[PDB]
């Protein structure tokens, strides 16, 4: 059994992306649910589980079958407990792009998540670890990270820092290996 992964904080999208590319045998992604009709290019069971009955997804949501769900553009979208469990039972860390609120929901499903928070040391540090954004964007990301830490510290397995994204990523990898026993 492989613990699923939630990385939060600045540069988490890059960390998620590089983990899968660099260790495709140890990491995976799960297939979410939607009630929106499928697009011509999409494949049922790969892009989404396309649910025919909105009423069916609604019962499942009320039954706590989703670690995260919401309505967007009049359609329901969720990441399901079973879909995550299916990835983990292949021995792959399920890389999740979900809210911090989902960590509690994963623990209640006995899925034992790893949650890692990337903490910026300062506004300047944001620009050290993310060299693709403006200063205006860096302050938004700095503000959001601050508020994330204040509300969700107890859900974090680890907090990692660095003066560069390479140092962040090295710590993220080492934490996952350590927590993988």
């Amino acid at each position: 059994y492989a613990r699923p992964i939630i990385i939060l904080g600045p540069t988490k999208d890059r960390a998620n992306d590089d983990l899968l590319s660099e260790f495709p045998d140890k990491f995976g992604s799960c297939v979410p649910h939607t009630t929106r009709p499928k697009r011509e290019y999409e494949i049922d069971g790969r892009d989404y589980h396309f649910v025919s009955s909105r009423e069916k997804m609604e019962k499942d949501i009320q039954a706590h079958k989703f670690i995260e769900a919401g309505q967007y553009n009049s359609h329901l979208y969720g990441t399901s407990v079973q879909s995550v469990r299916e990835v983990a039972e292949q021995g792959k860390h399920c890389i999740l792009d979900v809210s911090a609120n989902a960590v509690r929901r994963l623990q209640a499903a006995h899925l034992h998540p790893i949650a890692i928070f990337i903490r910026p040391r300062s506004l300047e540090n944001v620009l050290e670890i993310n060299k693709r954004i403006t200063e205006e964007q860096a302050r938004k990301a700095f503000d959001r990270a601050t508020k994330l830490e204040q509300e969700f510290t107890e859900c974090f397995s680890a907090i990692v820092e660095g003066d560069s994204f390479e140092e962040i990523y090295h710590k993220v990898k080492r934490v996952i290996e350590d927590l993988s026993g």
Partner: protein
């Protein structure tokens, strides 16, 4: 890097972006009159695409176009930050 635009006609443009994330479900394109009470228009292209056609634009009118990457790790919410430019056709 940046969002690139080429005018195909006074009513239509072709926007392009640099694939930075490797594991993208789809890209979400939104466009709307730069400064406008009118809701934004939007559509998607597969995560394999780095270009998209936007037609039906009012000629000479400023539009704000933004592209969101939705990763395979996410059910709907996009990666941050999105990329955006302001463009009007004709020159």
């Amino acid at each position: 890097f940046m969002l690139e635009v080429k005018e195909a006609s006074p009513t239509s443009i072709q926007i392009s972006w640099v694939l930075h994330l490797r594991h993208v479900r789809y890209y979400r394109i939104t466009y709307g009159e730069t400064g406008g009470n009118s809701p934004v228009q939007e559509f998607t292209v597969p995560g394999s695409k780095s270009t998209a056609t936007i037609s039906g634009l009012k000629p000479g009118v400023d539009y704000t176009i933004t592209v969101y990457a939705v990763t395979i790790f996410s059910a709907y919410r996009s990666a941050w930050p999105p990329i955006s430019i302001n463009y009007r056709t004709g020159s």
